């Protein structure tokens, strides 16, 4: 359609050239399939969506910006919703744009699951069935990995929580 246009006469000459017409379409389709695969690899890291715990207590950590808002339409978190405004994309003549295998809405759910998974189960969810852990306790493990002892987090959790909240 692009090269020859609507006219039949133009089409005949294109046939003479070969499988160039056919080959170019195949390459684009391969590219189109790849996009879905990339998104699939990046976000389908979790077997099962994990609903966020009803209790919002997280040992003084405020996660309101990061987590999805039920009142708001499209289940996009405040940080996420702000981001969409920042980047804005804004058929015609033989060129067609195909919609993503994963709808923006679906992508939102995947992100929430990881967020929900990380807070509720630590790193346990990555390697198997998610294991419930106290958030303060999870943070304690994190300090140990980086060489600051767990007691240190517990001694001034409040100071740490405020900095984290302020940072977010």
């Amino acid at each position: 359609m692009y090269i020859c246009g609507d006219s039949t006469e133009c089409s005949n000459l294109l046939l003479q050239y070969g499988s160039f017409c056919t080959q170019l379409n195949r390459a684009l389709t391969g590219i189109a399939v790849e996009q879905d695969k990339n998104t699939q690899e990046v976000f389908a890291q979790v077997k099962q969506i994990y609903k966020t715990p009803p209790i919002k207590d997280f040992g003084g950590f405020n996660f309101s910006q990061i987590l999805p808002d039920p009142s708001k339409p499209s289940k996009r978190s405040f940080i996420e919703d702000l981001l969409f405004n920042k980047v804005t994309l804004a058929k015609f003549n033989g060129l067609t744009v195909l919609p993503p295998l994963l709808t923006d809405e679906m992508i939102a759910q995947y992100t929430s699951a990881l967020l929900a998974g990380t807070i509720t189960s630590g790193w346990t969810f990555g390697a198997g069935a998610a294991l419930q852990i106290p958030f303060a306790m999870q943070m304690a493990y994190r300090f140990n990995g980086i060489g600051v002892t767990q007691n240190v987090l517990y001694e001034n959790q409040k100071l740490i929580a405020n900095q984290f909240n302020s940072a977010i």
Partner: protein, 119 residues
Amino acid sequence: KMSECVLGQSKRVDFCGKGYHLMSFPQSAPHGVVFLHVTYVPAQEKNFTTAPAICHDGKAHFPREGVFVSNGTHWFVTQRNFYEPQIITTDNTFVSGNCDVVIGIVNNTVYDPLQPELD
């Protein structure tokens, strides 16, 4: 991937297989390399009530490597990945500061294993 997986063990989560990667073996394939990944995944989770610090004399201990885990009758310390219960003692703990500051704490005994050997 082969160099990290076949020689040595990779600490990176999910880089080689799914879950903790104990070891890996590689099998030759036509125009490719196939890697078989051996990984450790924890199958069963028994619910246990837990607390971060135990206050014995107004000083609160913390585990050297184990999340404090209590069935509800007594408090024992086990490795976070497999359930091994060890009676809490000075050997498995260290005391820093006073047990007023920590948000979550449970009063508990200490064994003091030097005393029964002495007496």
